[PDB]
Amino acid sequence: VYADSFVIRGDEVRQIAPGQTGKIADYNYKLPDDFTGCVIAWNSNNLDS
Amino acid sequence: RFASVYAWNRKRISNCVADYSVLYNSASFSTFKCYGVSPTKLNDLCFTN
């Protein structure tokens, strides 16, 4: 299990989930189609946005 | 100057070379869900009307 931690902008919250074609993470972080894991998103506005 | 919902202006794009790459590169469009064709492949297909 490889925990990956990082921060993106509020609007997206997509993580290229199945194969998402969004270009925010198309040049930053691509996640494979056969992804047997989990995706969790946390709000950071209160804790040093 | 687009018209009302029930009176959507219809424009027929004919006899020209299309540049969907420019449309994809623009960040103004929040939603770009392409149905029946992949948005990436739009730049190399040929169709009509």
UniProtKB/Swiss-Prot annotation, chain B:
Recorded superkingdom: Viruses
Effect of substituting S28P: In strain: Omicron/BA.1, Omicron/BA.2, Omicron/BA.2.12.1, Omicron/BA.2.75, Omicron/BA.4, Omicron/BA.5, Omicron/BQ.1.1, Omicron/XBB.1.5, Omicron/EG.5.1
Phenotype when changing S26L: In strain: Omicron/BA.1
Function (record text): Attaches the virion to the cell membrane by interacting with host receptor, initiating the infection. The major receptor is host ACE2. When S2/S2' has been cleaved, binding to the receptor triggers direct fusion at the cell membrane. When S2/S2' has not been cleaved, binding to the receptor results in internalization of the virus by endocytosis using host TFRC and GRM2 and leading to fusion of the virion membrane with the host endosomal membrane. Alternatively, may use NRP1/NRP2 and integrin as entry receptors.
Subunit structure comment from the entry: Binds to host ACE2. RBD also interacts with the N-linked glycan on 'Asn-90' of ACE2. Cleavage of S generates a polybasic C-terminal sequence on S1 that binds to host Neuropilin-1 (NRP1) and Neuropilin-2 (NRP2) receptors. Interacts with host integrin alpha-5/beta-1 (ITGA5:ITGB1) and with ACE2 in complex with integrin alpha-5/beta-1 (ITGA5:ITGB1). May interact via cytoplasmic c-terminus with M protein. May interact (via N-terminus) with host bilirubin and biliverdin, thereby preventing antibody binding to the SARS-CoV-2 spike NTD via an allosteric mechanism.
Protein name, UniProt field: Spike protein S1
Organism of derivation: Severe acute respiratory syndrome coronavirus 2 (2019-nCoV)
Top-level taxonomy: Viruses, Riboviria, Orthornavirae, Pisuviricota, Pisoniviricetes
Full protein stretch here: 346 to 394 of 1273
